[PDB]
C-alpha cells in the first residue's frame, strides 16, 4: 500500500501510437466474442444441470425460464455475433430443451 502518484503508466500509454499504424480499431471488438462464448457456455451448463436436479413439474417449469433468459444474451449482441456464432448460441438452447422434454413426458400426464 504505497499510496503514491503512479504517473509513469501514462509514459507507456504512448505505445497506442504503434496500434494506429495497423488496421482500424473496429477489429478490437472481436475480443468481446470470447466473453459471449464464456458466459453462454457457463450458463448453458447450469440449465443442463437444473433439469437433472428437478424431481417434479414445479422445478421443470423453472428450467423453462432459465432457457428463455439465455436466448436474450444473444439478442443483445445479435448484430455483432457472426452467422456462425449467432446460429450456434440459438440452436444450442434447443439442444438442452430436449433434455427437459425427455423428463416432462414421464412427469406430466399423457393423453
Amino acid at each position: 500500500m504505497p499510496e503514491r502518484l503512479q504517473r509513469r503508466e501514462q509514459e507507456r500509454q504512448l505505445e497506442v501510437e504503434r496500434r494506429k499504424q495497423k488496421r482500424q480499431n473496429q477489429e478490437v471488438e472481436k475480443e468481446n466474442s470470447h466473453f459471449f462464448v464464456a458466459t453462454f457456455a457457463r450458463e448453458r451448463a447450469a440449465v443442463e444441470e437444473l433439469l437433472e436436479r428437478a424431481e417434479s413439474v414445479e422445478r421443470l417449469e423453472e428450467a423453462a425460464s432459465r432457457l428463455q433468459g439465455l436466448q436474450k444474451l444473444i439478442n443483445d449482441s445479435v448484430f455483432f455475433l457472426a452467422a456462425y456464432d449467432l446460429r450456434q448460441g440459438q440452436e444450442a438452447l434447443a439442444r438442452l430443451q430436449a433434455a427437459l422434454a425427455e423428463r416432462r413426458r414421464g412427469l406430466q400426464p399423457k393423453k
Side-chain angles (χ1 to χ4, degrees), residues 15-16 19 23 27 51-52 60 62 71 77 100 107:
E15 78 190 12
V16 75
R19 181 58 179 167
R23 288 282 189 75
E27 180 159 277
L51 63 88
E52 267 285 1
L60 199 84
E62 197 71 80
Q71 277 192 349
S77 309
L100 270 175
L107 285 173

Side-chain angles (χ1 to χ4, degrees), residues 11-60:
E11 187 279 315
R12 313 204 306 190
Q13 209 290 131
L14 288 163
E15 78 190 12
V16 75
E17 298 186 333
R18 184 67 80 169
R19 181 58 179 167
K20 205 73 167 70
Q21 281 82 87
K22 282 60 166 283
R23 288 282 189 75
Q24 197 174 119
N25 75 81
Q26 209 70 29
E27 180 159 277
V28 184
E29 304 190 358
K30 302 285 277 279
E31 81 98 68
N32 293 266
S33 73
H34 277 232
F35 196 108
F36 168 57
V37 182
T39 189
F40 187 85
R42 288 276 284 174
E43 279 290 278
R44 75 161 101 172
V47 191
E48 212 207 78
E49 204 162 73
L50 170 59
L51 63 88
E52 267 285 1
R53 287 187 71 173
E55 70 177 15
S56 282
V57 188
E58 199 202 87
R59 288 273 174 75
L60 199 84

Side-chain angles (χ1 to χ4, degrees), residues 43-108:
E43 279 290 278
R44 75 161 101 172
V47 191
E48 212 207 78
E49 204 162 73
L50 170 59
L51 63 88
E52 267 285 1
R53 287 187 71 173
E55 70 177 15
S56 282
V57 188
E58 199 202 87
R59 288 273 174 75
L60 199 84
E61 285 285 315
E62 197 71 80
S65 289
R66 304 303 295 193
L67 90 80
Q68 274 283 313
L70 248 184
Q71 277 192 349
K72 199 72 87 282
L73 165 58
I74 313 98
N75 189 71
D76 192 66
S77 309
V78 58
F79 309 129
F80 158 85
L81 296 174
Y84 167 72
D85 223 333
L86 169 52
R87 203 69 162 182
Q88 273 279 329
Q90 289 273 52
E91 78 192 0
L93 268 307
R95 204 84 176 83
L96 321 178
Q97 214 214 62
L100 270 175
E102 285 283 6
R103 272 54 277 277
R104 188 270 192 78
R105 63 174 70 178
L107 285 173
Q108 274 190 50

